Amino acid sequence: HAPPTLWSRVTKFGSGWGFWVSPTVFITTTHVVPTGVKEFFGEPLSSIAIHQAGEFTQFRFSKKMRPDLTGMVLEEGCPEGTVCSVLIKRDSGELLPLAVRMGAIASMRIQGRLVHGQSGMLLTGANAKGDLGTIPGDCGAPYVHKRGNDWVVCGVHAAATKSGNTVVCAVQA
Ligand SMILES: *[C@@H](O)[C@@H]1CCC(=O)NCCn2cc(nn2)C[C@H](NC(=O)OCc2ccccc2)C(=O)N[C@@H](CC2CCCCC2)C(=O)N1
């Protein structure tokens, strides 16, 4: 199970969520980012290094924003067949992890936008029956997996079919 400190990195952002990889690095899905703003988390644009492509957005803040956190490994997707957890939070603070089996990393077009991403299949047998990943507010949620005693983040939720049975996370190139 993703531990409490890992969930504490999942942060409401724009029209979805993002995730603190370290005290200075925040990741999210590009389409959830607010536009026309002068700051993120109170920090001026001039103090943030932005790197975004293919629906993956990274912010690197000049100041330590979340010094409570260790830096963890961010990878460009994961090996095919990895089971990830998508760390979906809801507005109440309820935690709703979504288990997904990952498939190929590829560049694909979704609603006319380039997504550099990794597809995956919802695991019906590892999830409670109910709309995880299939509402706009769930985009940006991180895809994580445990490697040894360490958690790795490898993408951010970007897309899913109507049913939610097939998902895509954006990945950092
Ligand atoms: C977070 O903003 C959204 C999470 C997905 C979601 O809520 N899905 C349920 C509703 N829905 C959306 C779509 N269809 N149903 C459109 C699109 N999904 C899609 O194209 O699936 C087919 C598919 C094709 C190839 C590979 C995998 C699946 C989708 O999810 N769109 C996405 C917004 C776009 C915005 C512009 C950049 C890329 C994502 C979305 O609704 N995400």
From Swiss-Prot:
Catalytic activity entry: Endopeptidase with a preference for cleavage when the P1 position is occupied by Glu-|-Xaa and the P1' position is occupied by Gly-|-Yaa
* Resulting phenotype, residue 139 to A: Complete loss of 3CLpro activity
Q: What is the effect of changing residue 55 to G?
A: Complete loss of 3CLpro activity
Q: Where is the Peptidase C37 domain?
A: 2-173
Give the annotated active site. Answer: 31 (for 3clpro activity), 55 (for 3clpro activity), 139 (for 3clpro activity)
Note how its activity is modulated: Inhibited by the chemical compound K36/GC376, which covalently binds to the nucleophilic cysteine residue. Inhibited by various macrocyclic inhibitors.
Q: How does it assemble?
A: Homodimer. Monomer; in solution.
Job of this protein: Processes the polyprotein. 3CLpro-RdRp is first released by autocleavage, then all other proteins are cleaved. May cleave host polyadenylate-binding protein thereby inhibiting cellular translation.
Q: What is this protein called?
A: 3C-like protease
Q: Where does this protein come from, organism-wise?
A: Norovirus (strain Human/NoV/United States/Norwalk/1968/GI) (Hu/NV/NV/1968/US)
> According to the entry, what is the taxonomic lineage of the organism?
Viruses, Riboviria, Orthornavirae, Pisuviricota, Pisoniviricetes
Whole-protein coverage range: 1101 to 1273 of 1789
